Amino acid sequence: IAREDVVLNRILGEGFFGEVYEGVYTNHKGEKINVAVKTCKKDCTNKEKFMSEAVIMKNLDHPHIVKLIGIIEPTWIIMELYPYGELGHYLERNKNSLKVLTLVLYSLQICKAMAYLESCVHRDIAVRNILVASPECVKLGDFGLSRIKWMSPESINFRRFTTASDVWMFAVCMWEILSFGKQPFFWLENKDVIGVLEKGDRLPKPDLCPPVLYTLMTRCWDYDPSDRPRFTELVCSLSDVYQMEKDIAM
Numbered sequence: 001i002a003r004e005d006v007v008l009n010r011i012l013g014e015g016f017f018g019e020v021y022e023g024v025y026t027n028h029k030g031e032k033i034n035v036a037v038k039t040c041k042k043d044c045t046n047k048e049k050f051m052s053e054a055v056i057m058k059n060l061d062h063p064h065i066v067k068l069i070g071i072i073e074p075t076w077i078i079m080e081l082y083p084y085g086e087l088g089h090y091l092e093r094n095k096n097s098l099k100v101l102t103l104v105l106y107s108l109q110i111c112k113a114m115a116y117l118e119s120c121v122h123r124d125i126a127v128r129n130i131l132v133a134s135p136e137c138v139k140l141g142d143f144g145l146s147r148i149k150w151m152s153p154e155s156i157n158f159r160r161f162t163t164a165s166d167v168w169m170f171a172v173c174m175w176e177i178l179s180f181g182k183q184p185f186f187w188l189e190n191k192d193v194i195g196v197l198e199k200g201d202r203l204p205k206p207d208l209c210p211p212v213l214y215t216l217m218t219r220c221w222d223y224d225p226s227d228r229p230r231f232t233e234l235v236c237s238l239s240d241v242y243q244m245e246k247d248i249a250m
């Protein structure tokens, strides 16, 4: 991509490596696309991790992961912009109008993204880091995509981070979604989390959450990571919950 084909309109926010801008990319066929432009600070050491995380994104293609459009090799990563913004905020603003079928759909879409990644891990599966492409489509963000109140017991007790630990974190994300964006364990200080988990206590069932889905979340929070469902199983389970909620709804 040539720099002249990308115009910056305003600040979006401060990314991990530097500022992110809202802009417009115009095709070699001359069509306009709203984009998010990731930059690197001129003070950066990480400048190589920044490009290598971009190479990874360049090689990913999934309907439920944010799309990289191209890389202007000051180095800019051109991502597709999703103007509805973050899922957390979207849930909070729309909680009067959102139905449970849609929250289950978002969960299923993220689960498919995770199943794909498993076929890489994602260390920030959380509603603040998920983008809303449209009212019926969400996209896992790039930040945290790689090769405390969100973390598995083994991740806390022993610094281990496996796919089974991502399944734990995924159910936390599901809990956030079904709670309309509430923070997991907002009632606790970090130091208290593991003791609660060790006693067998878990995030409580959100009000809107179908009991079958809470039972699913509960399995994902099995203390022994080997007993937790795998992402492929979860896709099937969630697809069943979704189809059922669809019939119940209409």
Ligand SMILES: CS(=O)(=O)N1CCCCC(=O)N2CCc3cc(ccc32)Nc2ncc(C(F)(F)F)c(n2)NCc2cccnc21
Binding pocket: 012, 013, 014, 015, 016, 020, 036, 066, 067, 079, 080, 081, 082, 083, 084, 085, 086, 128, 129, 130, 131, 141, 142
């Ligand atoms: C902190 S940041 O990383 O700068 N940032 C911007 C947060 C702005 C919040 C807001 O008011 N708004 C209102 C308008 C808006 C549109 C979008 C995000 C937020 C907001 N859309 C968007 N699409 C794609 C990407 C990318 F494809 F690139 F992921 C992206 N953002 N990445 C940016 C980002 C993704 C997650 C979490 N935070 C941030």
